[PDB]
Ligand binder design. Structure first.
Ligand SMILES: Cc1cc2nc3c(=O)[nH]c(=O)nc-3n(C[C@H](O)[C@H](O)[C@H](O)COP(=O)(O)OP(=O)(O)OC[C@H]3O[C@@H](n4cnc5c(N)ncnc54)[C@H](O)[C@@H]3O)c2cc1C
Ligand code: HEM
Ligand SMILES: CC1=C(C(=O)Nc2ccccc2)SCCO1
Ligand SMILES: O=C([O-])[C@H](O)C=C([O-])O
Ligand code: SF4
Ligand code: F3S
Ligand code: FES
Ligand code: NA
Lengths: 588, 238, 121, 105
């Protein structure tokens, strides 16, 4: 060891919503835990979250966790593991009420209970009338949640390593993950964080696209790290394009706009969603509302303007009093980035890259999975994953609005509750040798030595453009095969890319370079995946295979990093407390 | 059209002291961009320029800067609001904090005052609720204008009293947070809290200078918050 | 040891910030002023001759100036101190807009008193 | 403590404001300032009391004010306590010198 070694029982890489619930939970179970974050914990993408948390509290109306389980399984287009969705939807209410006790400042009903708003794909009585179960704090719910969890980690004296960039996972000689090497952004020091549990909580990867609702920091870091360690990723082709991103900006306006009574109009003033989804209307599934807006533009019925092609989101009818109280956050977002006042005039909106449904395959415990040579699941000892970087999978092919925040809290907490059994189950793990650690540093050393290679700026711009064009809302086998060819080219260019700033005192260039590597593996894993799946399920929409193929593709897709091929994994359809929901034709 | 910037630079491994460097950027005439767009592009030209940013939508609080003399967030300040005829756009770190590198400041002391006011719900556990704590929309209203704070530091690093005693005076940001728990109807520790703000510096170094209010990217008002804190302190200790 | 950005020339200051820094200075001046004013009062009362000597001092143009300054600073400290106190008792709002407004009205009320102090001298 | 300092300043400010009203009042309504009407105003019990009362008020008000100012700027301890010594002594002198002037009139 010629590196400093910092030992903990658990290292949580990422201080977003899910990292911080996990860290807080591991910590209260009397285990030492290091919380890393490449930004200050409250700058994590979770802060930008708006709509709220979907959960059968049953405050606005009588509700039932099974109805929410139904909504989700259907929402997922029948490839969400149902044992997991059952766990989530059922645990939900207590797990969220816990946050309200932590001081989270939820909005209120007149009687004093947590406010719940209507949201996309929510129904009473298993596919019946429109429900309202998205608990919220105005439209700043993610902010409210993150800041509360930070405060809770402050109260509980969690060891937080703010502004450290995790480089890569360290594997011992048994193929077990025993921590990770990380770079301290402030000072440039590189250290080995040794652990018996390494928990990846590194959020999403919107920045593989040209236009995304995601923060600049969403660079699929966990996907890269996991792929390079030979850990498979799953369902990488499932990319949620949020219906209402602001046209020409990418900054999200919430689904809570439609949930509060707002609706989508085309150039002729037709509420086109009544045609596309006659029951649920504008509160249909996101992949459906997404495609609906695109079909509208793609046939000349979209509007233009300084914003580019878009549909309109009409809100003005809800009144000043309700907009400034329930949705004041999008009011500022619209005025700033669209120069449009939603109290007077509709917001310009186009489907934008939003949420990564895929990620590292996990058990409910948060334990990370791989497959053996026979295709069976085996646990990756010492590796765990929670949050957006996880593919549990509770979202399958399309995530419901307000279900990601639930995901974070429920599985973050679960990973902590279950960490002691998980360490005991995997047994003691052998020490990493000095070469094992050195291997984690190989990636970083390459950039620190490459002075004359390619400008990474152009490599990035190439990458994002390629994804935008070839792997968007609609896809065809032709464009996808060519898109993959260019990615093999761009990935070559990156192996010879130059780091232009050589300094150590807070060198943001080095970070953004290391991020690019992660953008690459994430774009690649998505591209190889979307090619493999020859059907149309949820967000994944092929012209050349427009039918949902329940006979061949009622499964998860799995990218195998070592041989760079694909394979499938079972969807789980055995809930413990009720019978499964069978696959049927899904229309809104 | 051409834009000129005078931007604060400093590297302790290179620079003896800090210096202003000049920058030009060719921008699209008919498009208006944000300062952060300009900074991002300047790093394509000069990779050594270091600065914080994330959400790029004025929610996360990462990119607080002193722009043409006044604090704000780069991500939400338009080029047009800064650009003047024949004058450079002058970008400098937040005032009063240790510069780590270029436009990055050590926020240490800003966080440390935040930690000092115990910014977490403190409920004694007596008469616990069946489910959630019950809060009437009336009482929840009192948290509006307080919980939205993004810890961007703009207000505190524009307060003289904070400059002079950054480790003894809580500062606008801190005091805003303090009041956020002082009037939360779910927090039972109000007296205990007030007793920890009764000294000469914690609260009473605020003199209503009102730099705090003018700069807040989220248009909150620390002055009015501190007013209510003082009120409560007189109510209790006078 | 690290550097900090505290160059006061590189920083915009709104009118309420100016109003405040002048209140601080005006206070420090008024402190020294009391000693000067007491010393002058002492003289002007000790004997009929002392008073004539004090009128003679007050006759000097240079004194008339310092005296007008002294009384201007005091007049300021009082008007801008009353603004402050009104805010503290809720008679003025604590919004940024109500701040700018009262600051200006404080400068106007001060100039008026500063002239009347010139008249008295 | 802090709350005490806050009330004392504002209280003395009120007393001092009432005193200034009283001084400017006389000054703006007397015309010719002859030695005799000047000494007549300052030999009056009302004036003597209000003046010393005001002098005590300046002792307390200015001392707090000066302290606040010094603990913002004069950082090194030695030098700060020296300046406070001078400043207090001065203010104490002001009240005592005040007692001498008006007792002798
Ligand atoms: C604008 C917007 C609004 C949304 N609103 C909602 C909503 O209302 N309801 C809902 O359910 N979902 C919502 N979502 C979905 C949402 O984006 C995510 O579900 C969630 O907020 C992110 O969870 P996370 O904790 O896993 O990731 P993040 O919050 O992004 O956390 C990533 C963390 O990992 C750290 N990290 C990354 N790389 C490294 C590295 N290599 N080394 C060390 N640390 C690293 C970062 O520092 C960061 O703290 C919204 C999304 C967007 C973009
Ligand atoms: C007559 C002799 C007076 C003297 C020697 C004096 C001096 C001072 C001094 C030195 C300060 C320090 C304040 C700072 O740091 O900015 C101060 C503050 C102050 N002065 Fe006075 N002053 C006098 C009269 C008055 C009067 C009549 C008022 C009536 C409003 C007043 C109002 C105030 C207030 C409110 C403060 C503190 C404000 C704050 O803490 O925010 N002063 N004074
Ligand atoms: C601390 C304080 C003042 C001050 O020190 N501010 C200041 C302004 C500009 C330059 C230096 C200091 S002004 C009124 C009372 O509060
Ligand atoms: O509409 C939003 O606020 C956001 O896009 C919601 C979820 O649920 O992710
Ligand atoms: S009150 Fe405003 S300026 Fe101050 S830290 Fe909070 S968000 Fe930033
Ligand atoms: S900037 Fe400082 S003085 Fe008080 S009102 Fe303001 S906190
Ligand atoms: S980038 Fe997050 S607020 Fe400016
Ligand atoms: Na995911």
């Amino acid at each position: 060891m010629k590196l400093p070694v910092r030992e903990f029982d658990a290292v949580v890489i990422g201080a977003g919503g899910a990292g911080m619930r996990a860290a807080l939970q591991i910590s209260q179970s009397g285990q030492t835990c290091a919380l890393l974050s490449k930004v200050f914990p409250t700058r994590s993408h979770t802060v930008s979250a708006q709509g709220g948390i979907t959960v059968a509290l049953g405050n606005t109306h009588e509700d039932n966790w099974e109805w929410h389980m139904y909504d989700t399984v259907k929402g997922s287009d029948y490839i969400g593991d149902q044992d997991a969705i059952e766990y989530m939807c059922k645990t939900g209410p207590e797990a969220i009420l816990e946050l309200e006790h932590m001081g989270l400042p939820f909005s209120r009903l007149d009687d004093g209970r947590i406010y719940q708003r209507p949201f996309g794909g929510q129904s009473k009585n298993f596919g019946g009338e429109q429900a309202a179960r998205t608990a919220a704090a105005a439209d700043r719910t993610g902010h409210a949640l993150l800041h509360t969890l930070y405060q809770q980690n402050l109260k509980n004296h969690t060891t937080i390593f703010s502004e450290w960039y995790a480089l890569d996972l360290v594997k011992n000689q048994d193929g077990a993950v025993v921590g990770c090497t990380a770079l301290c952004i402030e000072t440039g020091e590189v250290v080995y964080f040794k652990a018996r549990a390494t928990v990846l909580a590194t959020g999403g990867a919107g920045r593989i696209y040209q236009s995304t609702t995601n923060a600049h920091i969403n660079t699929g870091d966990g996907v890269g790290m996991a792929i390079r360690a030979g850990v498979p990723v799953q369902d990488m082709e499932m990319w949620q394009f949020h219906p209402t991103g602001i046209a020409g900006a990418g900054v999200l306006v919430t689904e809570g706009c439609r949930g509060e009574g707002g609706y989508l109009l085309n150039k002729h003033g037709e509420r086109f969603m009544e045609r596309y989804a006659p029951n649920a209307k504008d509160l249909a599934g996101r992949d459906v509302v997404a495609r609906s807006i695109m079909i509208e533009i793609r046939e000349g019925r979209g509007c233009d303007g300084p914003w580019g092609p878009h549909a309109k989101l009409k809100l003005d009818h809800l009144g000043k009093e309700v907009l400034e109280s329930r949705l004041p956050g999008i009011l500022e977002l619209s005025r700033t980035f669209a120069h449009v006042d939603p109290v007077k005039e509709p917001i310009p909106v186009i489907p934008t890259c939003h949420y990564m449904m895929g990620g590292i395959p996990t058990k409910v415990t948060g334990q990370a999975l791989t497959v053996n040579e026979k295709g069976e699941d085996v646990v990756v000892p010492g590796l765990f994953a929670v949050g957006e970087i996880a593919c549990v999978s509770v979202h399958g092919a399309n995530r419901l609005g307000g279900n990601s925040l639930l995901d974070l809290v429920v599985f973050g907490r679960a990973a902590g509750l279950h960490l002691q059994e998980s360490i005991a189950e995997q047994g003691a793990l052998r020490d990493a040798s000095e070469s094992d650690v050195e291997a984690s540093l190989d990636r970083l050393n390459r950039w620190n030595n490459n002075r004359n290679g390619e400008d990474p700026v152009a490599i990035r711009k190439a990458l994002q453009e390629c994804m935008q064009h070839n792997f968007s809302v609609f896809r065809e086998g032709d464009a996808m095969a060519k898109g993959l060819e260019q990615l093999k080219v761009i990935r070559e260019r990156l192996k010879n890319a130059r780091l232009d700033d050589t300094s150590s005192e807070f060198n943001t260039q080095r970070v953004e370079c290391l991020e690019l590597d992660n953008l690459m593996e994430t774009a690649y894993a998505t591209a190889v995946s979307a090619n493999f799946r020859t059907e149309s399920r949820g967000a994944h929409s092929r012209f050349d295979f427009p039918d949902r193929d329940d006979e061949n593709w009622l499964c998860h897709s799995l990218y195998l990093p070592e041989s760079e091929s694909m394979t499938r994994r079972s969807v789980n359809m055995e809930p413990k407390l009720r019978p499964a929901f069978p696959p049927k034709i899904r229309t809104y | 059209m051409r834009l000129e910037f005078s931007i604060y630079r400093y590297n302790p491994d290179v620079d003896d002291a800090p210096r202003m460097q000049d920058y030009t950027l060719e921008a699209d005439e008919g498009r208006d961009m944000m300062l952060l767009d300009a900074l991002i592009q300047l790093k394509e030209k000069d990779p050594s320029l270091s600065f914080r940013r994330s959400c790029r939508e004025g929610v996360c609080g990462s990119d607080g800067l002193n722009m043409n003399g006044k604090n704000g967030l780069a991500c939400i300040t338009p080029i047009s609001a800064l650009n003047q005829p024949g004058k450079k756009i002058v970008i400098r770190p937040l005032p009063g904090l240790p510069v780590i590198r270029d436009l990055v400041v050590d926020m240490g002391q800003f966080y440390a005052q935040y930690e000092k006011i115990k910014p977490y719900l403190l409920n004694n556990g007596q008469n616990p609720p069946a489910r959630e704590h019950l809060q009437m929309p009336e009482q929840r209203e009192k948290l509006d204008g307080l919980y939205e704070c993004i810890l961007c530091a703009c207000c505190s690093t524009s307060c003289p009293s904070f400059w002079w005693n950054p480790d003894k005076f809580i500062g606008p940001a801190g005091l805003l947070a303090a009041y956020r728990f002082l009037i939360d109807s779910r927090d039972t520790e109000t007296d205990s809290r007030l007793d920890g703000l009764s000294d000469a510096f914690s609260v009473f170094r605020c003199h209503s200078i009102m730099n705090c209010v003018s700069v807040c990217p989220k248009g909150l008002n620390p002055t009015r918050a501190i007013g209510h804190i003082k009120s409560m302190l007189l109510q209790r200790n006078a | 040891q690290r550097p900090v950005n505290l160059d006061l020339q590189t920083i915009r200051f709104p009118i309420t910030a100016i109003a405040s820094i002048l209140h601080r200075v005006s206070g420090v001046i008024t402190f020294v002023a009391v000693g000067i004013l007491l010393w002058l009062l002492g003289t002007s009362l000790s004997s009929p001759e002392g008073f004539e000597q004090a009128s003679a001092i007050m006759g000097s143009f240079f004194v008339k100036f310092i005296m007008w300054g002294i009384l201007t600073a005091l007049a300021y400290h009082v008007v801008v101190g009353i603004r402050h106190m009104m805010m503290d008792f809720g008679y003025l709002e604590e919004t940024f807009e109500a701040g700018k407004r009262s600051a200006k009205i404080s400068f106007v009320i001060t100039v008026v008193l500063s002239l009347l102090a010139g008249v008295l001298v | 403590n802090g709350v005490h300092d806050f009330i004392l300043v504002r209280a003395t400010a009120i007393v001092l404001t009432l005193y200034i009203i009283y001084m400017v009042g006389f000054f703006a309504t007397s015309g010719e300032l002859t030695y005799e009407v000047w000494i007549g105003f300052f030999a009056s019990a009302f004036t003597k009391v209000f003046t010393l009362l005001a002098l005590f008020s300046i002792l307390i008000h200015a001392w707090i004010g000066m302290w606040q100012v010094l603990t913002d700027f004069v950082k090194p301890l030695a030098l700060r306590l020296m300046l406070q010594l001078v400043i207090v002594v001065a203010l104490v002198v002001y009240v005592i010198y005040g007692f001498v002037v008006v007792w002798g009139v």
